Amino acid sequence: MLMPKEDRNKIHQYLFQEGVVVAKKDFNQAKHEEIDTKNLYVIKALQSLTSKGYVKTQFSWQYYYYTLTEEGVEYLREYLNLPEHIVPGTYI
Amino acid sequence: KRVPVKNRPTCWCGKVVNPDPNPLDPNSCGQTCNASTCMHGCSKICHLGPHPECTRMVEIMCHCGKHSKSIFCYQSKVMKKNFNCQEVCGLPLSCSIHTCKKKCHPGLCGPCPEMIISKDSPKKQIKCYCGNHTRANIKCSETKFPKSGKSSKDENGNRWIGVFACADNRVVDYSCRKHSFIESCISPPTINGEKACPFLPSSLKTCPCGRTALEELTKPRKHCDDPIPTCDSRCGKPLKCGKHSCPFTCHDKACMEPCLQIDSVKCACEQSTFSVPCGFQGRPRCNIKCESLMSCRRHRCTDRCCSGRPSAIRRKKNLFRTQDLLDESLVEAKHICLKPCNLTLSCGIHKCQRKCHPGKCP
Amino acid sequence: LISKKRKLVADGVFYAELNEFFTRELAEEGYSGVEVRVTPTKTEVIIRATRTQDVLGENGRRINELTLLVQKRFKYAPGTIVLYAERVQDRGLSAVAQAESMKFKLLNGLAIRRAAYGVVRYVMESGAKGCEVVVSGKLRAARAKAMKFADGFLIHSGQPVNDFIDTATRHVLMRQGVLGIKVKIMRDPAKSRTGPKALPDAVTIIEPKEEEPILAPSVKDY
Amino acid sequence: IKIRITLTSTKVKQLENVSSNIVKNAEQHNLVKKGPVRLPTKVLKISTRKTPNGEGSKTWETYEMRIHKRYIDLEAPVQIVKRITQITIEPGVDVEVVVA
Amino acid sequence: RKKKVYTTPKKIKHKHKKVKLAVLSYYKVDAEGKVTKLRRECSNPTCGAGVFLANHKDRLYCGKCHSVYKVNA
RNA sequence: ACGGAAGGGCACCACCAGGAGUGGAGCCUGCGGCUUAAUUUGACUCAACACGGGGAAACUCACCAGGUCCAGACACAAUAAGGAUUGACAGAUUGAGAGCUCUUUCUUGAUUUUGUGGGUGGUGGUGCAUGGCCGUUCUUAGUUGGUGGAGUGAUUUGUCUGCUUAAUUGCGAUAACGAACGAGACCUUAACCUACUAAAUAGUGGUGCUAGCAUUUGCUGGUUAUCCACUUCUUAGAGGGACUAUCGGUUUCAAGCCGAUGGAAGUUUGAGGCAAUAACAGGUCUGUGAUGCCCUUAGACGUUCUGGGCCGCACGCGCGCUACACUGACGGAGCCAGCGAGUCUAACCUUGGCCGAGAGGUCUUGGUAAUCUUGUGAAACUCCGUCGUGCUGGGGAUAGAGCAUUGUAAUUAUUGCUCUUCAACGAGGAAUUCCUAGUAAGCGCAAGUCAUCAGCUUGCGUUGAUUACGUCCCUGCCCUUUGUACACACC
Ligand SMILES: [Mg+2]
Ligand SMILES: [Mg+2]
Ligand SMILES: [Mg+2]
Ligand SMILES: [Mg+2]
Ligand SMILES: [Mg+2]
Ligand SMILES: [Mg+2]
Ligand SMILES: [Mg+2]
Ligand SMILES: [Mg+2]
Ligand SMILES: [Mg+2]
Ligand SMILES: [Mg+2]
Ligand SMILES: [Mg+2]
Ligand SMILES: [Mg+2]
Ligand SMILES: [Mg+2]
Ligand SMILES: [Mg+2]
Ligand SMILES: [Mg+2]
Ligand SMILES: [Mg+2]
Ligand SMILES: [Mg+2]
Ligand SMILES: [Mg+2]
Ligand SMILES: [Mg+2]
Ligand SMILES: [Mg+2]
Ligand SMILES: [Mg+2]
Ligand SMILES: [Mg+2]
Ligand SMILES: [Mg+2]
Ligand SMILES: [Mg+2]
Ligand SMILES: [Mg+2]
Ligand SMILES: [Mg+2]
Ligand SMILES: [Mg+2]
Ligand SMILES: [Zn+2]
Ligand SMILES: [Zn+2]
Ligand SMILES: [Zn+2]
Ligand SMILES: [Zn+2]
Ligand SMILES: [Zn+2]
Ligand SMILES: [Zn+2]
Ligand SMILES: [Zn+2]
Ligand SMILES: [Zn+2]
Ligand SMILES: [Zn+2]
Ligand SMILES: [Zn+2]
Ligand SMILES: [Zn+2]
Ligand SMILES: [Zn+2]
Ligand SMILES: [Zn+2]
Ligand SMILES: [Zn+2]
Ligand SMILES: [Zn+2]
Ligand SMILES: [Zn+2]
Ligand SMILES: [Zn+2]
């Protein structure tokens, strides 16, 4: 799905720092909470990451809970160009 | 996810496949695993079990950068979000007569907030652009130096910088110095007679109301003495009060201070609004009784449109302690009750000699 | 600034949504329920499950991601919401846990009678007064039917149903369609410890202690 | 000092034991108090058709949630005020304390 | 659900693809001399020194400005 | 299982004695039919038809006439920074400042585009492929093991002749004994408590302060910071209380039943909630991100935008609402409930003041609520008048004109208000519904839906009768016996 590279990156870095992301199933909302990108953009970007085994999705009353996997955190690490085990969303 | 590859026991580090058997370190080369959480890597040698907390201290700085903090990598990151040296920033504030009084802080010092207190000298007194009002103190940023950039000038023309303007309104004379027009306190307000005369044909080619040129509206008056031709469009001349301009049809003379236009003013009771012209001397009175508590609180004030009542309503609205209710001074003087208490004493065979008072008799 | 009616309905719907979320994601962890405790400066969410090690993960990583999930969705401040995991007792006396275990057995490919008799034997062994499991749907044929498997005794009417029977219903998504699993467990009223210890119509007469007839007047003195 | 404690649960027994240990703590500390005023129980009713579709006999069904509210007025100094608001935490019982 | 006759006319008329030209960015060509810039830029510096201001007829047009910079040179 | 077979027992979804009706009229609303571009659709005896919470202006929305967009993940291959692709002013075009498409060029830069696979969505089909839920059989008393007994067996007994009960409820009898579910118990609600604990968010009395009328002292009020006292009324928590008590009849003289007394209460005290086994090819894929299969998937049956439609009217049906007038209409007065609901990052329930015939407007105010709206000052009702047996001052359908409110929008009138118009209807044929006491009936109120819109529904109180206290005639239900050529079971 066509979106700009910068807000694709914004979605990806929010996913990397927080480790989870909750997106209400409300297309045309045009402003996600906690991310200044459109809700449709975050939903479809995370669906694309879900398809390549990088994040898991749970639906549960119209809200799309996403949690990224280990292959996902490694992929986002080398995607956003961070050093190995710099800072994932897995702090003790 | 997957079956271990056949024939691959590893060193505890995993760095080395086919670990050399060591009785001292089982399944281990014995060289540091060095898996890097802390960038340096695990301090301990390869082992069964996870890596211990990092031992290398790192240095981060306080908000202003003046001091550093050597903290262990394992904790430092958290400590980082909290470090503050707290030495005062001290940077000169923009006014330049002040220095930031804030302690070490992230970001800029911000606006000078040093209160400016006029010292006890006439020159020292802070004043208005008109210079009518002298003020004891103001915030430094809040001082607004005149946009004109000219100091307040009076008839003397002595210029003392004004950093605010008083609200008061003053009339300013025409050059003719015969008739005058009402105006507001202004930056460097003009001396009387400085203003060009509307009545004089040469000085003003427009109507008193302005709006359209005077010549187009009517033939221009021959002389300054001759009145400027009045026109239907409203003059809009400022009132002495300044609450409103003027909706009257244009007139050559200045707008009269009394106003046919009545301004709604609410009574002390506030339950009623009486419309009175601007410049009215008095507070509106409505025939209703105050009906509010006396200082004793055993009686209700019967005065009509009492001066004490608005204060009493506000006093009631404010949260009052039991002590506060007992105190007579908080209650307004008009409301204070001077009647004799006339209540039985502790014995009950005597009457209180005191005047009516809140609380139990002595 | 909310009325008490709307506040209590709102935290009821919050409990219902949280329970639905947990039963959607923690199905393979033996999720057996949730409890909410509001506290000055903190609200705590107690998950009652069987596999607490799978609920937690390494250093509670799944717990951290579940706290972050419920936080992000329900707009809580950092530190205001905390989740704990707790190993439920008497797993045989948990209709939701038994229904989920039966669902996963049927999905893995166990026979219906073998799975149902396994769950009824486990519940009866766990000290229940009775168990009853119903499987409904297309069983070995295009025409649907219902199979019932019971042991012990179960009651059906009155307030003791709310007191003693626990029931759960699950949807099993087989390749021919949906099977319905219904599990009813009547616990022993004697082991309750919270509320009535017996059925309403149970009457216990205590045994009179027998004393020998004295047949002689006597006086004890001090 | 004029504090008021409001308890607004749906669980009668937990509400009553919270009220009881607050009032016994108050009389143990010898605090003058207005006793637990029990407001009218407010019943929240929702009436629905039983059927998910619309056929059959028109059978209706009323569900209700009962809210029980109590309040206690206390005149106690501030240290016992914080100890009271730090003690008596019960699941399902909503407690709020207000001053003046 | 019978069928769709499509009484609306034959209008499968899907547009261009940002029409594929040859090489672009014609500034100008100069033998052993400096090249200037044809299609002079928008006065808005949000659209500055990189945008070719369009020249259709009787107006000029911007994409970096957005859609609106209408002047008649 | 059925019987136009028998015996016993029952039920106002049966009758009897009656009450209110409905069926006749106008209108409202749902269904069919017809009509239509479309008038989306499910459901058709009880157990479809004011039902899908279905009171649709847009939305909802599924239908019709048209216009966009992709929200086609992912993989592979191709094109490809000498550029994959995206967007767009103006004009043309279009209902449309939709570049949708075209002219003209700018802009973007690896996200895309094209093809194959594979997905995704679908209020598309299938409720006769399903889950769950609901309805119904079936508001009645019924259902099942174990071990014994009978039978070659299907099966039977237990689970029964009598009597009793609302009840396989019990007394009992007894090839059965001991059990389980259902019934009952239970739980919620309504009735009682001058007994307990209390209450400035409930009240009452007294004392302060104060008004009016009287005159020793009284009566009716106002004011809570003016304080004190109390808990009868009110609200809860904890308990008490009824168990058919006592007495008298009657019955193998048992279970029980009938009368009287006492009692707040004596039809299991009233009303509910819960509610077995076995089933229906009942309803529902249009509640569901519940679902299998089938269909479709980019000029899509996805989704959105604009405009229509769901309301269209020769007709036939089912819920209802207003009435045919004096046991009334109208006008002034009088003047009394209970159940409830309400605003935060919003704009809800709204007192009071002012303006306006009204509807409404406006300035404020209290209330996140036992406090404020709200004593919800409701309506029927009472009392004085006006009318006067005239389709009449009964009735208010159908029309015309104007003023307001909700809403982006009211044209096929959203509702409200004002003046005018003033139709059927003179108590309703065969038929047919519901109902036994604070019940029927009358009367309004709150809530649901809800921006606006009740002639609907779910509850609530106000006023309050007649007539049974039975029966098996009709329509059905339970149990037993009996006949059967029935077993998809008398259609
Ligand atoms: Mg009867
Ligand atoms: Mg009938
Ligand atoms: Mg009859
Ligand atoms: Mg009628
Ligand atoms: Mg029936
Ligand atoms: Mg529509
Ligand atoms: Mg539409
Ligand atoms: Mg659709
Ligand atoms: Mg069916
Ligand atoms: Mg079904
Ligand atoms: Mg046998
Ligand atoms: Mg035998
Ligand atoms: Mg047997
Ligand atoms: Mg008084
Ligand atoms: Mg007797
Ligand atoms: Mg009963
Ligand atoms: Mg369904
Ligand atoms: Mg319709
Ligand atoms: Mg009906
Ligand atoms: Mg009339
Ligand atoms: Mg009248
Ligand atoms: Mg009332
Ligand atoms: Mg409507
Ligand atoms: Mg309504
Ligand atoms: Mg309706
Ligand atoms: Mg025969
Ligand atoms: Mg046959
Ligand atoms: Zn090693
Ligand atoms: Zn380190
Ligand atoms: Zn290590
Ligand atoms: Zn510092
Ligand atoms: Zn300064
Ligand atoms: Zn500073
Ligand atoms: Zn001044
Ligand atoms: Zn002059
Ligand atoms: Zn003029
Ligand atoms: Zn003037
Ligand atoms: Zn004035
Ligand atoms: Zn006064
Ligand atoms: Zn006094
Ligand atoms: Zn006044
Ligand atoms: Zn004395
Ligand atoms: Zn005194
Ligand atoms: Zn530009």
* SS3 sequence of chain A: CCCCHHHHHHHHHHHHHHCEEECCCCCCCCCCCCCCCCHHHHHHHHHHHHHCCCEEEECCCCCCEEEECHHHHHHHHHHHCCCCCCCCCCCC
d(CA A34, CA A57): 18
Q: CB of C140 under 7 A from strand F?
A: no
- Identify all chain D residues contacting C5, using CB atoms and an 8 Å cutoff: 42, 44, 67
d(CA C119, CA C136): 16
Helix, strand, or coil here: B130?
A: coil
Q: What token pair was written down for D74? A: 């206390």
Helix, strand, or coil here: B116?
A: strand
Task: At B195, give phi and psi (nearest 5°).
Answer: -65, 140
Nearest to B92 by CA among B84, B83, B101: B101
**Conformation bin of residue E64: beta by default, left when phi > 0, alpha when psi is -120 to 50:** alpha
Alpha helices in B140-188 (DSSP H): none
Going along chain D from its start, the domains and CATH numbers come out as: 1-90 (3.30.70.600)
Who's near B182: CB < 8 A, 6+ residues apart?
A: B169, B171, B172, B237, B238, B239, B240, B254, B255
Task: At B96, give phi and psi (nearest 5°).
Answer: 85, -5
Between chain A and chain B, how many beta carbons pairs sit less than 8 Å apart? 5
Bases on strand F under 7 Å from any protein CB: 42-43, 47-49, 51-54, 65-68, 70-75, 82-90, 99-113, 124, 129-136, 180-187, 197-201, 208-210, 223, 225-226, 235-238, 273-279, 281-285, 287-293, 299, 301, 339-344, 368-370, 457-459
For the segment 51-80 of chain D, residues whose CB is within 7 A of strand F: 51-62, 68-69, 71
Q: What token pair was written down for C86? A: 């707790």
H or E stretch covering B220: none
Q: What token pair was written down for C58? A: 């390494």
Contact A76, A11 (CB under 8 A): no
Q: What token pair was written down for A87? A: 């800072």
In terms of Cβ atoms closer than 10 Å to its own Cβ (0-12, 13-18, 19+), residue B88 is: middle
Amino acid of residue C126: S
Triad B67, B69, B74: Cα angle to 5°: 160
Choose the mutation target among D84, D90, D94 for the interface with C, i.e. most C CBs under 10 Å: D94
A–D touching, 3+ CB–CB pairs within 8 Å: no
Q: Which residues of C23-62 are buried (b: 16+ CB within 10 A; e: fewer)?
A: bebbeebbbbbbeeeeeeeebebebbbbebeebbeeebeb
E–A touching, 3+ CB–CB pairs within 8 Å: no
d(CA B252, CA B263): 25
Nearest to A5 by CA among A13, A84, A67, E66: A13
Nearest to B261 by CA among B272, B273, B245: B245
**What's the Cα-to-Cα distance from C115 to each of C31, C154, C181, rounded to whole Å?**
19, 20, 11
- Ligand 29 centroid distance, CA of B78 (Å): 14
Q: Locate the chain C residue with the closest alpha carbon to A23.
A: C73
Contact A22, A65 (CB under 8 A): yes
**What's the Cα-to-Cα distance from C110 to each of C31, C114, D95, rounded to whole Å?**
21, 7, 51
Nearest to B302 by CA among B318, B285, B287, B283: B287
Taking the CA of residue D53 and the C1' sugar atom of nucleotide F30, their distance in angstroms comes to 17
Q: What token pair was written down for B194? A: 């400085």
- Ligand 34 centroid distance, CA of B146 (Å): 12
Nearest to B283 by CA among B298, B269, B294: B269
Nearest to D33 by CA among D70, D76, D69, D96: D76
CATH of C12-86 given 3.30.300.20, 2.60.40.10, 3.90.1570.10, 3.40.630.10? 3.30.300.20
Nearest to D42 by CA among C9, B86, B89, B92: C9
**Conformation bin of residue A32: beta by default, left when phi > 0, alpha when psi is -120 to 50:** beta
Triad D77, D81, D84: Cα angle to 5°: 140
The alpha carbon of residue C30 and the mean position of all alpha carbons in its chain are separated, in whole angstroms, by 11
Nearest to C134 by CA among C173, C181, C100: C181
- Asked whether the CA dihedral B230, B235, B239, B240 is positive or negative, the reply is negative
Contact C70, C18 (CB under 8 A): yes
DSSP for residue B278? T
Q: CB of B293 under 7 A from strand F?
A: yes
**Conformation bin of residue B240: beta by default, left when phi > 0, alpha when psi is -120 to 50:** alpha
Task: At B75, give phi and psi (nearest 5°).
Answer: -105, -40
- Asked whether the CA dihedral B19, B24, B26, B32 is positive or negative, the reply is negative
Looking at the DSSP bridge assignments, the partners of residue B61 are: B68
**What's the Cα-to-Cα distance from B352 to each of B10, B294, B316, rounded to whole Å?**
102, 18, 28
Picking from D69, D89, D91, the nearest residue to C4 by CB comes out as D69
DSSP string, chain C: ---HHHHHHHHHHHHHHHHHHHHHHSGGGT--EEEEEEETTEEEEEEEES-HHHHH-GGGHHHHHHHHHHHHHHTPPTTSEEEEEEE-S-GGG-HHHHHHHHHHHHHHT--HHHHHHHHHHHHHHTT-SEEEEEEEE-SSSSS-EEEEEEEE----SSHHHHHHEEEEEEEEEETTEEEEEEEEEE--GGG--SS-SS-TT---PPPPPP-----S------
Nearest to C94 by CA among C117, C135, C128: C128
Q: How many residues belong to chain D?
A: 100
CA end-to-end distance (rounded Å), chain E: 59
Taking the CA of residue C157 and the C1' sugar atom of nucleotide F268, their distance in angstroms comes to 18
d(CA C38, CA D14): 14
**What's the Cα-to-Cα distance from C217 to each of C209, C211, C220, rounded to whole Å?**
22, 16, 10
In terms of Cβ atoms closer than 10 Å to its own Cβ (0-12, 13-18, 19+), residue B339 is: exposed
H or E stretch covering B61: strand B57-61
The CATH code of domain C95-191 reads 3.30.1140.32
d(CA B16, CA A89): 29
Triad B313, B316, B318: Cα angle to 5°: 110
**Conformation bin of residue C122: beta by default, left when phi > 0, alpha when psi is -120 to 50:** alpha
Between chain C and chain D, how many beta carbons pairs sit less than 8 Å apart? 27
Picking from D67, D85, D86, the nearest residue to C8 by CB comes out as D67
Taking the CA of residue C26 and the C1' sugar atom of nucleotide F140, their distance in angstroms comes to 46
Nearest to C69 by CA among A23, E21, B100, B324: A23
Contact C185, C95 (CB under 8 A): yes
What is the biggest distance separating any 2 CA atoms in chain E, rounded to whole angstroms?
73
Residues just before a chain gap in chain A (C–N exceeding 2.5 Å) are: none
Contact B131, B156 (CB under 8 A): no
Who's near C24: CB < 8 A, 6+ residues apart?
A: A58, A59, A60
User: Radius of gyration over alpha carbons of chain A, in Å?
Assistant: 13
Nearest to B155 by CA among B182, B126, B186, B189: B189
Q: Which residues of A49-87 are buried (b: 16+ CB within 10 A; e: fewer)?
A: bbeeebbeeeebeebbbbbbeeebbebbbeeeeeeeeee
* Three-state DSSP string of C150-209: EEECCCCCCHHHHHHEEEEEEEEEECCEEEEEEEEEECCHHHCCCCCCCCCCCCCCCCCC
Picking from A19, A63, A92, the nearest residue to C65 by CB comes out as A19
Instruction: Return the axis-axis angle of helices A39-51 and A5-18, rounded to nearest 10°.
Output: 70
Looking at the DSSP bridge assignments, the partners of residue C36 are: C45
- Asked whether the CA dihedral C89, C95, C100, C106 is positive or negative, the reply is positive
So where are chain C's domains?
Answer: 12-86, 95-191
Task: At C24, give phi and psi (nearest 5°).
Answer: -80, -35
d(CA B116, CA B325): 39
Ligand closest to B40 (CA) is 29
Nearest to B145 by CA among B127, B129, B163, B120: B163
